Nucleic acid binder design. Structure first.
Ligand code: ZN
Ligand code: ZN
Ligand code: ZN
Ligand code: ZN
Lengths: 130, 130
RNA sequence: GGCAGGGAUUUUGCCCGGAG
RNA sequence: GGCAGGGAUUUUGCCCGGAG
C-alpha cells in the first residue's frame, strides 16, 4: 500500500510559505486516535484560483510515505469538493461560478458553511466557536 | 463653551458594549499633546446601518462636559463623512449605495482606505502595519 | 450568510441548512 | 481593493489613489 486514502482536518497552514499539515483522523476508512500528521503543499490542493487551507477545515485526500514523512498527493474537501482556503461559493461543490440550483455535479451531502465538515452544521461548528 | 469641536482617532470600541473612547488630538482646531480621552456611545455615530468604530479610525466630532467626563454628541469621519466601524462604500462620502463617480455630494479630500485619515494613504497607513 | 443596541476606559453578541 | 507560489511542523507576503 503506497497510495492511501486519508481524511481529517487542516492542522495548520502558512499561506506565504505555501505549505502546512493535515491532522489525519481516518486512514483507509479506519479511525485514528491520536491523529497523525500529513504534509500538504499548496500545489496539491483542489481549489479554484489561489490555493491555501484554513486551520481546521475538513479535508479528504490521498497520500504516500516520502523520505521527509507522509505526503499528501491530492487534497479536496469531503466528497472531492473544492477546499475553502484563507484571506460566495456553491453549497453543493464549493465552485465560485454558480449556486447549488445550477450545479452540474451530483448532489453532495450538506457541509458546515464554515469548515465544510459533513458531521455538523454551522450553528454547532466547534471551529466557529473561536 | 458648552458645545465643542474635536478631532482625533478612535482609542478603542467595544461593539457588544455599545461604547468606547476617542483619543482627541485637536480641541477647537488647536493641537493637543498629550491627547485627551472623549467617550463615544454607539447612538452618537454618523453611519449607515450598524454603528461601531474601529480602533484608530480618523474621527471628527462635537463634544460636551458631562458629570462622568467628556461626552461626544455626534461622531463622523473627517469632513462629516460616515464612520467605518467593525465586522462597498463610496471613496468620496463613505456611502454604501454608490461609487465616487456617481456621488452627489461635493468633492471631499482623499482619505486612507483603511482608517479614513486625510494625512496619509493606505500604502503608508500606520494602522494597517499591524 | 443574516440580524443587532450592556452610557463612562480597552478589541462583539446572537441567529441560520436541499439552498444565496 | 487587487495580485500571488519559500516542499516537511504551526496561523501571509507584495502592490495600489480624483477612482471600484
Ligand atoms: Zn456546484
Ligand atoms: Zn464547522
Ligand atoms: Zn458618495
Ligand atoms: Zn490609514
Amino acid at each position: 500500500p503506497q497510495l492511501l486514502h486519508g481524511a481529517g482536518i487542516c492542522k495548520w497552514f502558512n499561506v506565504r510559505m505555501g505549505f502546512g499539515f493535515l491532522s489525519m483522523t481516518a486512514r483507509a476508512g479506519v479511525a485514528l486516535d491520536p491523529p497523525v500528521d500529513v504534509f500538504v503543499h499548496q500545489s496539491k490542493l483542489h481549489m479554484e484560483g489561489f490555493r491555501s487551507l484554513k486551520e481546521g477545515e475538513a479535508v479528504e485526500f490521498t497520500f504516500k510515505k516520502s523520505a521527509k514523512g507522509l505526503e499528501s498527493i491530492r487534497v479536496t474537501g469531503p466528497g472531492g469538493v473544492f477546499c475553502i482556503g484563507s484571506e460566495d461559493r456553491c453549497y453543493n461543490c464549493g465552485g465560485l461560478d454558480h449556486h447549488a440550483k445550477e450545479c452540474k455535479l451530483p448532489p453532495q451531502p450538506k457541509k458546515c458553511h464554515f469548515c465544510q465538515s459533513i458531521n455538523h452544521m454551522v450553528a454547532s461548528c466547534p471551529l466557529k466557536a473561536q
